[PDB]
Amino acid sequence: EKGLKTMVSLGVKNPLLDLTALEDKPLDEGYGISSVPSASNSKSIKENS
């Protein structure tokens, strides 16, 4: 799954699975009103599992 998401890609992505819809998600790289989404800190044992 991580190879399909990171290394490998998909196939059925034209009008369906539109790039613009993906662009709308994830907000922006710069600081946002609710940037706190993916935290580089806070890696536990049970939560990671």
Partner 1 sequence: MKLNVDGLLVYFPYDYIYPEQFSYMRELKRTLDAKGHGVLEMPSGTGKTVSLLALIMAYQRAYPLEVTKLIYCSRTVPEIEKVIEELRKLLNFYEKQEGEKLPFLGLALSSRKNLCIHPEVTPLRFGKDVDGKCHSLTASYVRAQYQHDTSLPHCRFYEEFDAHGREVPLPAGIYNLDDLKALGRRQGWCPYFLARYSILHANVVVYSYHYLLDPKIADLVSKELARKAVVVFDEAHNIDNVCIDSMSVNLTRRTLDRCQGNLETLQKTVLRIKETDEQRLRDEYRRLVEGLREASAARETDAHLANPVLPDEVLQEAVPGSIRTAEHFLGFLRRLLEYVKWRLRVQHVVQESPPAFLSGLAQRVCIQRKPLRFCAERLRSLLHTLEITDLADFSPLTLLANFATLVSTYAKGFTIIIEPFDDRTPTIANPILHFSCMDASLAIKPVFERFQSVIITSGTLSPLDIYPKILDFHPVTMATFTMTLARVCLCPMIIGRGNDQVAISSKFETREDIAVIRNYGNLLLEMSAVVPDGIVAFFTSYQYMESTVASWYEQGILENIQRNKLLFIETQDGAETSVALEKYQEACENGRGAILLSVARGKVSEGIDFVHHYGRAVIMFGVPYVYTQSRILKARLEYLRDQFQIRENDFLTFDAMRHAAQCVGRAIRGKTDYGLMVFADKRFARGDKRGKLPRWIQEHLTDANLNLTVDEGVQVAKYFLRQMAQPFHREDQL
Contact residues for partner 1, defined by CB under 8 A: 1, 5, 20, 22-31, 33-34, 36-39, 41-42, 46-47
Extract the runs of DSSP E, i.e. beta strands, from 1-49. none
- Nearest approach, Cβ of residue 36 and partner 1 (Å): 8
- Nearest approach, Cβ of residue 7 and partner 1 (Å): 14
- Nearest approach, Cβ of residue 30 and partner 1 (Å): 4
Lookup result for tokens 């994830």: 26
Taking the C-alpha atoms of residue 3 and residue 45, their distance in angstroms, rounded to an integer, is: 23
